[PDB]
Amino acid sequence: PGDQICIGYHANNSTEKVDTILERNVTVTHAKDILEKTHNGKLCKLNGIPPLELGDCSIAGWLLGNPECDRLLSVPEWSYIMEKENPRLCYPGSFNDYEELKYLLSS
Amino acid sequence: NCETKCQTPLGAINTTLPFHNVHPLTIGECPRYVKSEKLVLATGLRNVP
Amino acid sequence: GLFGAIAGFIEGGWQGMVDGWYGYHHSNDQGSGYAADKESTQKAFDGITNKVNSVIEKMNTQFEAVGKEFSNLERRLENLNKKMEDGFLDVWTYNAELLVLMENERTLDFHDSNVKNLYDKVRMQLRDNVKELGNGCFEFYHKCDDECMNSVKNGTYDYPKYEEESKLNRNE
Amino acid sequence: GLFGAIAGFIEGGWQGMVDGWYGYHHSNDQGSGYAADKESTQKAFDGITNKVNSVIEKMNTQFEAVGKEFSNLERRLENLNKKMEDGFLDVWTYNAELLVLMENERTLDFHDSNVKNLYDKVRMQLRDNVKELGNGCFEFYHKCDDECMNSVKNGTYDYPKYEEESKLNRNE
Amino acid sequence: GLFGAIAGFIEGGWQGMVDGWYGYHHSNDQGSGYAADKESTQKAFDGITNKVNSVIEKMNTQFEAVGKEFSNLERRLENLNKKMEDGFLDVWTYNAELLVLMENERTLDFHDSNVKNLYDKVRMQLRDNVKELGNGCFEFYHKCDDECMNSVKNGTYDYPKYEEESKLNRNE
Numbered sequence: 001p002g003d004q005i006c007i008g009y010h011a012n013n014s015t016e017k018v019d020t021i022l023e024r025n026v027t028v029t030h031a032k033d034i035l036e037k038t039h040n041g042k043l044c045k046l047n048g049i050p051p052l053e054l055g056d057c058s059i060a061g062w063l064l065g066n067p068e069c070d071r072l073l074s075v076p077e078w079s080y081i082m083e084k085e086n087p088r089l090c091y092p093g094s095f096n097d098y099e100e101l102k103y104l105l106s107s
Numbered sequence: 108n109c110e111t112k113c114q115t116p117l118g119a120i121n122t123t124l125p126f127h128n129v130h131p132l133t134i135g136e137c138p139r140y141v142k143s144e145k146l147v148l149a150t151g152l153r154n155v156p
Numbered sequence: 157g158l159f160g161a162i163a164g165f166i167e168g169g170w171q172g173m174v175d176g177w178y179g180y181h182h183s184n185d186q187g188s189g190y191a192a193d194k195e196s197t198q199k200a201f202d203g204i205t206n207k208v209n210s211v212i213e214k215m216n217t218q219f220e221a222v223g224k225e226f227s228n229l230e231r232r233l234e235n236l237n238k239k240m241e242d243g244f245l246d247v248w249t250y251n252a253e254l255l256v257l258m259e260n261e262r263t264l265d266f267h268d269s270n271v272k273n274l275y276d277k278v279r280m281q282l283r284d285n286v287k288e289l290g291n292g293c294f295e296f297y298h299k300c301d302d303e304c305m306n307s308v309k310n311g312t313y314d315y316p317k318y319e320e321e322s323k324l325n326r327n328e
Numbered sequence: 329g330l331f332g333a334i335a336g337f338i339e340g341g342w343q344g345m346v347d348g349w350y351g352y353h354h355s356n357d358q359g360s361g362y363a364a365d366k367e368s369t370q371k372a373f374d375g376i377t378n379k380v381n382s383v384i385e386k387m388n389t390q391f392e393a394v395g396k397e398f399s400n401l402e403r404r405l406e407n408l409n410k411k412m413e414d415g416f417l418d419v420w421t422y423n424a425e426l427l428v429l430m431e432n433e434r435t436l437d438f439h440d441s442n443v444k445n446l447y448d449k450v451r452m453q454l455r456d457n458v459k460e461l462g463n464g465c466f467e468f469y470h471k472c473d474d475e476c477m478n479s480v481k482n483g484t485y486d487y488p489k490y491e492e493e494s495k496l497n498r499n500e
Numbered sequence: 501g502l503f504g505a506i507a508g509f510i511e512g513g514w515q516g517m518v519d520g521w522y523g524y525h526h527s528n529d530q531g532s533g534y535a536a537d538k539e540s541t542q543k544a545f546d547g548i549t550n551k552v553n554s555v556i557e558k559m560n561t562q563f564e565a566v567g568k569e570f571s572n573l574e575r576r577l578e579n580l581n582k583k584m585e586d587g588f589l590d591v592w593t594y595n596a597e598l599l600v601l602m603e604n605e606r607t608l609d610f611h612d613s614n615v616k617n618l619y620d621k622v623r624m625q626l627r628d629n630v631k632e633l634g635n636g637c638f639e640f641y642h643k644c645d646d647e648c649m650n651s652v653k654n655g656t657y658d659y660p661k662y663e664e665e666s667k668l669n670r671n672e
Contacts, residue, residue, distance in 0.1 A: 011169025029151030036127035
């Protein structure tokens with residue numbers, strides 16, 4: 001026959017699909033996902049400092065000293081505040097500028 | 108016990124990438140929330156047999 | 157694609173080349189086999205990693221806290237916060253998706269350009285000493301060998317050496 | 329354009345071709361006439377429709393209600409709402425306009441690439457059996473016919489058949 | 501780059517050409533020297549200025565007043581205003597930076613295409629009357645002069661005039 005030299009490109013067993021502005025479902029040799037999809041279920045501390053965990057209690061009940069709320073925590077510092085669905089105040093009433101207070105104490 | 112820069116109700120996240128689709132409610136230095144299910148960049152070339 | 161190499165006049169890819177992204181295949185009296193092109197492949201790799209590092213590292217950090225913070229006393233301010241969240245959501249979603257599409261199109265075309273450029277670099281060096289088969293191969297009008305193949309690959313090929321032999325075999 | 333075909337070395341377009349986007353014109357002993365290239369045209373059409381479907385379908389819905397909702401008691405919250413509206417307005421206007429410009433540039437270049445690629449596909453097949461006129465045409469060094477033209481168009485052209493006749497007429 | 505001219509098969513640039521962006525260098529019996537290509541250069545200039553005018557003039561104006569305007573009575577509305585400011589800041593920063601990168605990539609490739617296109621325009625005109633050196637030059641198989649060089653540059657070159665002399669010197 002004749003003597004030959006050819007130009008060619010890589011190919012593999014990769015099955016990864018990507019979309020383009022022109023074509024869709026295009027298979028490529030390698031790709032990188034830039035979307036974070038992970039929900040590990042963990043609740044960590046934030047930038048070195050733990051969150052204040054009120055549980056069933058609420059900021060109002062916590063500060064006032066609601067008998068149905070356990071002080072047990074008493075942390076001098078926190079990053080965020082974690083709770084639960086539904087609060088449970090003993091003596092009925094209202095709290096003025098309550099939301100502003102929750103934001104103030106959020107950290 | 109763990110450390111994270113971004114915290115969500117469904118968990119923590121690695122913060123390395125620019126986008127996430129985990130949860131809208133978020134606290135920390137966090138990626139941009141998008142409605143996308145997947146954002147895949149092509150690094151290699153087109154795969155042809 | 158855009159430069160007509162990948163899935164173009166070069167129909168398929170080479171499973172046998174694990175060495176790099178673009179390379180050569182030689183078939184002669186000694187023996188056949190594949191070999192990569194380190195220069196072109198590494199250049200592409202450096203550019204590609206620089207690309208994904210661009211769309212990732214250029215994103216701004218900004219510590220924020222997303223939440224309700226507005227009671228039922230103020231449902232207008234809730235709705236305001238909701239308009240804002242969604243407004244940005246629509247902005248980031250649309251921009252991110254189109255970014256990825258446009259960037260992937262560019263990347264595939266980028267690879268295409270690289271293969272085509274290597275093809276042109278080779279053809280420009282070999283000239284009429286070979287028969288351009290059109291599938292991405294060149295059939296020599298003379299007898300090349302492993303010592304001659306390496307000369308083609310490394311950028312120093314002797315045309316006038318094989319000029320007269322090729323001419324005679326060309327008009328054969 | 330970028331690949332130098334449209335408004336390039338191929339000066340004008342063909343009014344006579346209603347069949348498709350890119351095609352051939354043959355002029356021989358039988359008779360002249362136009363004919364499209366279904367493969368290249370349909371590929372382009374599929375990509376283009378996929379393009380406009382991308383910039384349209386990828387947009388997020390989001391039911392919202394734009395309005396004042398803030399009295400004269402609160403002119404600061406009005407101004408806030410106004411900053412937000414305008415902020416997004418400036419974002420969407422700028423992004424949309426530049427999107428259209430960049431996408432149109434790509435589209436025209438895309439077409440250019442397609443024509444050029446068809447030209448190269450043809451030239452690579454015909455080789456030296458023809459005189460490349462440079463205007464987008466090839467003058468045969470032999471006598472081709474409707475039976476031979478169709479062979480060129482459909483991808484199966486016999487070079488060695490016309491090799492010797494072309495050579496003699498070439499050095500004429 | 502993408503079309504393999506700049507930093508490609510044409511290794512360096514010409515300091516000696518202050519006349520324009522792309523041009524010729526001729527070396528003959530009369531004397532050497534540089535000369536620009538007004539058509540290609542001016543076309544590029546018009547497109548480039550139209551480009552930077554696009555990313556600048558298409559930006560929306562919008563008179564606004566950025567400031568605090570919210571007391572310590574309302575720290576939630578402060579935080580809202582802050583989320584909004586930063587939200588847009590992150591949007592404009594990211595979009596602007598990626599815009600510049602993508603546009604610069606296109607611009608460099610655009611220039612590359614222009615040089616390559618001029619090279620192809622020349623080569624397509626000269627045909628086999630010259631030896632394509634591969635560095636961006638063409639060595640004539642005949643004796644060209646300042647009167648002949650200008651003919652090449654201005655788009656009217658006489659191939660059949662130098663056909664037979666070139667052929668004989670080619671098979672020399």
